[PDB]
Design a protein around this ligand. Structure first.
Ligand code: FMN
Ligand code: LU2
Length: 288
């Protein structure tokens, strides 16, 4: 089993070390290991080394991703990789694209794109401003429905490379991901149970009558029982969860329906005149 470790920190930084430490644990369980340092890659924002990166990820049976924490979440580059995953890696759209290709004599997309895969994440920050990175990390796995094994946060971690018990945790995360990879079907989540019984998220969007899991999208209710929170939802919601095939097929269907409505609206006079008033009112300022 091939484990790919990816770091988004500085060259030779703490994220490099935690990630290489996971890789060492993985080799201990018998895996072939590879390491990619993202500072060596050129990756543009969603509007270039990205295709290469994805090819590397598609060949791995499991992935360990270690990211610095910036403003409580993953780095902007981690969010760009997430942006760029959609068009390429959505499990829903790739199932559709492959069925369509078969039946219409089209060329069969990358079979790798649909293989099951396990992924673990590590978020390394220097303080306790760490409340959003696990969700950010979960979002990247959500689009292709890779099976999350661990999704770990390390606050106060500037000196983590001399904190033996926390380095030992990353070693164990490496063990887990190699073990999970040996049998991706029977691999099971090893991380924290969290609050969302489906996502394991602890991040929720709250409004009167509706608490929403910020990762899996389940709409339900948060309960405070003496300081312990818990999340409940009605079973019909499972159909709609953003990390299930069912919920993705629905989501994509609404996208197709709303995209057709936009195309049609873009041919109305209402649209064209408002747009022309905007073009006439102002011109975008650019640098010299
Ligand atoms: C602009 C910036 C914002 C940061 N924001 C946070 C933060 O919100 N929470 C946090 O825990 N650490 C934060 N950090 C600390 C970085 O996570 C830390 O420097 C990183 O773990 C270093 O990893 P490396 O050694 O691999 O580069 C921030 C660092 C920078 C430079
Ligand atoms: O190393 C850290 C460095 C910084 C930081 C960010 C922007 C600056 O203009 C600056 O002068 C320092 O912010 C942090 C914020 C954190 O929560 C944890 C950290 O380790 C850091």
């Amino acid at each position: 089993m091939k484990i790919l470790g990816i770091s988004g920190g500085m060259r030779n930084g703490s994220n490099d070390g935690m990630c290489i430490e996971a890789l060492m644990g993985a080799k201990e369980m018998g895996a072939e290991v590879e390491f990619i340092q993202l500072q060596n890659l050129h990756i543009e924002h969603c509007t270039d080394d990205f295709d290469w990166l994805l090819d590397k990820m598609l060949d791995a049976d499991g992935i360990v991703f270690s990211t610095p924490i910036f403003e409580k979440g993953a780095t902007g580059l981690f969010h760009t990789i997430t942006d760029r995953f959609g068009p390429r890696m959505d499990r829903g759209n790739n199932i559709i694209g492959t069925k369509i290709a078969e039946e219409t004599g089209g060329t069969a997309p990358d079979p790798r794109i649909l293989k099951d895969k396990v992924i673990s994440f590590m978020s390394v920050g220097g303080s306790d401003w760490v409340t959003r990175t696990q969700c950010d990390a979960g979002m990247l796995a959500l689009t292709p429905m890779w099976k999350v094994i661990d999704n770990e946060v390390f606050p106060w971690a500037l000196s983590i490379l001399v904190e033996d018990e926390r380095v030992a945790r990353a070693h164990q995360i490496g063990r887990n991901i190699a073990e999970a990879a040996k049998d991706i079907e029977h691999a099971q989540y090893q991380g924290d149970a969290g609050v969302c019984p489906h996502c394991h998220s602890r991040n929720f969007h709250l409004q009167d009558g509706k608490a929403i899991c910020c990762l899996c999208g389940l709409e339900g209710e948060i309960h405070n029982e003496g300081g312990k929170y818990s999340f409940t939802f009605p079973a019909e919601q499972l159909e709609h969860a953003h990390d299930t095939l069912s919920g993705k097929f629905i989501h994509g269907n609404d996208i197709k329906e709303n995209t057709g409505k936009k195309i049609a609206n873009m041919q109305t006079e209402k649209y064209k005149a408002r747009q022309a008033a905007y073009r006439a009112f102002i011109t975008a300022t650019v640098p010299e």
